[PDB]
Amino acid sequence: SNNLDSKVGGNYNYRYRLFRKSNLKPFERDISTEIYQAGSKPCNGVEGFNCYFPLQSYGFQPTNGVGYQPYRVVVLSFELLHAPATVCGPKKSTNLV
Amino acid sequence: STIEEQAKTFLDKFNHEAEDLFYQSSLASWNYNTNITEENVQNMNNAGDKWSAFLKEQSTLAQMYPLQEIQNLTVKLQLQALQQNGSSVLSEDKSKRLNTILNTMSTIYSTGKVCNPDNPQECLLLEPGLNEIMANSLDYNERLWAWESWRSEVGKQLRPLYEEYVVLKNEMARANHYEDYGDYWRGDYEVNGVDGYDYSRGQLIEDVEHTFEEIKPLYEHLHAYVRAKLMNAYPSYISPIGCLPAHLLGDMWGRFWTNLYSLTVPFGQKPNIDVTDAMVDQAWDAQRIFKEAEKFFVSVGLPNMTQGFWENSMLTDPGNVQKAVCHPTAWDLGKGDFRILMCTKVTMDDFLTAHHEMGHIQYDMAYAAQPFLLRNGANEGFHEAVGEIMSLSAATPKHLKSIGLLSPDFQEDNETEINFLLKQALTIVGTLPFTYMLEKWRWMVFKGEIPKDQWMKKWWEMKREIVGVVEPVPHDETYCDPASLFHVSNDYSFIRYYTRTLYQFQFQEALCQAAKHEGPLHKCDISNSTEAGQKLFNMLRLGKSEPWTLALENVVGAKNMNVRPLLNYFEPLFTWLKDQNKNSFVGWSTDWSPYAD
């Protein structure tokens, strides 16, 4: 999506996390702005010595390369549950003799 | 938890922010060089000043993480770049005075000129005027007037400015835990904290001294060859056993003998390799020269270029209204965006220049995945040396005959190769001791071994001893010759030329072995050898994340500079120089001067 999402100065609307106090779980979501505290001292809501703001924005500029350009990614997770099924693709149909 | 997370987290914060900021200055420089205007130069300077301020603000947290107990080489190398203050150690008065000295020294160097005693109304500027006099003109008086008046008009004016530059810089380096600004330049190859690969700053002085003695057997024979040839043109001034005058070297600084090829032809009756007509006859253009040059890089096994590389590059000067810089320069705009600026013409001179700039990209593109602070070269030698080995192999007639430029009926003989081989030695062999001469002199000046008044006395002494060159007119203590050099007045390191030269043949011997090549290296051609490019890319991808000695240990077979691949390159040349020097004296005599009586 370089011709769609890239913006001069970087698309600051698409961000991501660089550090977290623990590893996420499968399909987990965490949008907290808590400061990553590494040392025993308190961060007091501001970064610095042994403290870091975990979220940063992407540098999606139009001059990016194949390894840095934006890519609209979608993941399709399926679930085989005891409950009944709901959706499968079209079945073939032909003429009537 | 531990302190290690602070450096690992802080460097990631810097590598994220400094990445886009550095690119904003790089693309602004691209926009300026592509369209020289008043608006772009401001965007170039505003961007560079912005990023430069970001480096100093980030040094506050860099110094709060001592590297004493840290064994991680990645964390050590990255923080050491920002932990150092540099020119910030002195007050603004000393820093501003230093910038005024360099700006004043650079202006006096650029604005130098010389007119004849008989024609004062036509004074020729440094470029292109006086450069042609030392390069093209063969007149004894024009070359002498351009040399002596340059030393008097420009050399004397740059003598006093060079004092505060040495004094102010020594105070800067000493505050940063160095012995002098000479040792500050030697710190580029510094390696600490690695077993079997550590490198002290003072080891560079021993390497150039050792290798110079190994270059002397090849240099003393070529110097006698050049003296014997120049003596035929100037017999009333050059002795068959004496020294070569300084104003007959080929330039206004005494660095290369490339301009003396016309006066030192080995065989002026035999032909040489030149595909300037083959490309014009084959309807080649600036794009096809670059495109066919890429086929050499992909054939050896190196990565190919992207579509953004070729689509956005410059091939010609877009008119005088938007005049661009036609100088060859490989650009790293960032985020995988790589480009080259060049006003290419259909000629063999630009054919090899294309491989040189394309070789620079292969250096930067290899370690592009490293961190931002580590996305750079390990030293100055690895940057420019890798570009020459690719162009030299392309200059070999084996590659030209394969591509179809040089016809296959061209005869190759030892008499013809000496023409191309000795022409190269005038550039290489006629430059190796001159850089060792200059940097040895400059290194002593920063340390303070040579007094400020004895600059010209010790400089002239080193010229007779190391290179065997003498001035055309004697100079007193008020002169300062080496300060008139571009690299000296603009605060640049010239030792990289010596290191790049010996590293060039070292990498060539490594890739020629990767090509399964036999014989001397002058006939080497790595074309269509997939293992050749693969061996190089394994080294280029390191960047500055590992020791530079490690890259040489497993590639070229040594940890420092060596003259072994130089002699193998110029192996038959030593025999040729031996025969022609039968009626001359190998070496030189320091007792002879052109103004002797």
Curated annotation (Swiss-Prot), chain A:
Outcome reported for the amino acid change (mutating residue 7 to T): In strain: Omicron/BQ.1.1
Impact reported for residue 9 to S: In strain: Omicron/BA.1, Omicron/BA.2.75, Omicron/XBB.1.5, Omicron/EG.5.1
Effect after changing residue 16 to F: In strain: B.1.1.298
Consequence of changing residue 64 to Y: Increased binding affinity to human ACE2
Effect of residue 64 to T: In strain: 19B/501T
Region ranges (Disordered): 18-53, 82-97
Outcome, altering residue 56 to N: Reduced host ACE2-binding affinity in vitro
Result of altering residue 56 to R: In strain: Omicron/BA.1, Omicron/BA.2, Omicron/BA.2.12.1
S-S bridge residues: 43-51
Effect on the protein upon substituting residue 61 to R: In strain: Omicron/BA.1, Omicron/BA.2, Omicron/BA.2.12.1, Omicron/BA.2.75, Omicron/BA.4, Omicron/BA.5, Omicron/BQ.1.1, Omicron/XBB.1.5, Omicron/EG.5.1
Effect annotated for changing residue 53 to S: In strain: Lambda/C.37, Omicron/BQ.1.1, Omicron/XBB.1.5, Omicron/EG.5.1
Effect caused by changing residue 47 to Q: In strain: Kappa/B.1.617.1
Region (Immunodominant HLA epitope recognized by the CD8+): 11-19
Region Receptor-binding motif, residue ranges: 1-71
Result when mutating residue 23 to K: In strain: Omicron/BA.2.75, Omicron/BQ.1.1, Omicron/XBB.1.5, Omicron/EG.5.1
Effect of residue 47 to A: In strain: Omicron/BA.1, Omicron/BA.2, Omicron/BA.2.12.1, Omicron/BA.2.75, Omicron/BA.4, Omicron/BA.5, Omicron/BQ.1.1, Omicron/XBB.1.5, Omicron/EG.5.1
Known role: Attaches the virion to the cell membrane by interacting with host receptor, initiating the infection. The major receptor is host ACE2. When S2/S2' has been cleaved, binding to the receptor triggers direct fusion at the cell membrane. When S2/S2' has not been cleaved, binding to the receptor results in internalization of the virus by endocytosis using host TFRC and GRM2 and leading to fusion of the virion membrane with the host endosomal membrane. Alternatively, may use NRP1/NRP2 and integrin as entry receptors.
Subunit architecture: Binds to host ACE2. RBD also interacts with the N-linked glycan on 'Asn-90' of ACE2. Cleavage of S generates a polybasic C-terminal sequence on S1 that binds to host Neuropilin-1 (NRP1) and Neuropilin-2 (NRP2) receptors. Interacts with host integrin alpha-5/beta-1 (ITGA5:ITGB1) and with ACE2 in complex with integrin alpha-5/beta-1 (ITGA5:ITGB1). May interact via cytoplasmic c-terminus with M protein. May interact (via N-terminus) with host bilirubin and biliverdin, thereby preventing antibody binding to the SARS-CoV-2 spike NTD via an allosteric mechanism.
Name of this protein: Spike protein S1
Organism in which the protein naturally occurs: Severe acute respiratory syndrome coronavirus 2
Gene name, Swiss-Prot/TrEMBL: S
Shown stretch of the complete protein: 438 to 534 of 1273
Swiss-Prot record, chain B:
Name of the encoding gene: ACE2
Its EC number(s): 3.4.17.23, 3.4.17.-
UniProt activity-regulation remark: Regulated by chloride and fluoride, but not bromide. Chloride increases angiotensin I and decreases angiotensin II cleavage. Inhibited by MLN-4760, cFP_Leu, and EDTA, but not by the ACE inhibitors lisinopril, captopril and enalaprilat. Highly potent and selective in vitro ACE2 inhibitors were identified.
Covalent S-S links between cysteines: 115-123, 326-343, 512-524
Organism expressing this protein natively: Homo sapiens (Human)
Full-length numbering of the shown residues: 19 to 615 of 805
Phenotypic consequence of residue 23 to A: Strongly inhibits interaction with SARS-CoV spike glycoprotein
Topology term for the membrane: Single-pass type I membrane protein
Effect of residue 13 to Y: Increases slightly the interaction with RBD domain of SARS-CoV-2 spike protein
Entry protein name: Angiotensin-converting enzyme 2
Annotated substrate binding sites: 255, 327-328, 497
Domain Peptidase M2: 1-589
Cofactor info, note text: Binds 1 zinc ion per subunit.
GO BP: angiotensin maturation; angiotensin-mediated drinking behavior; blood vessel diameter maintenance; entry receptor-mediated virion attachment to host cell; maternal process involved in female pregnancy; membrane fusion; negative regulation of ERK1 and ERK2 cascade; negative regulation of smooth muscle cell proliferation
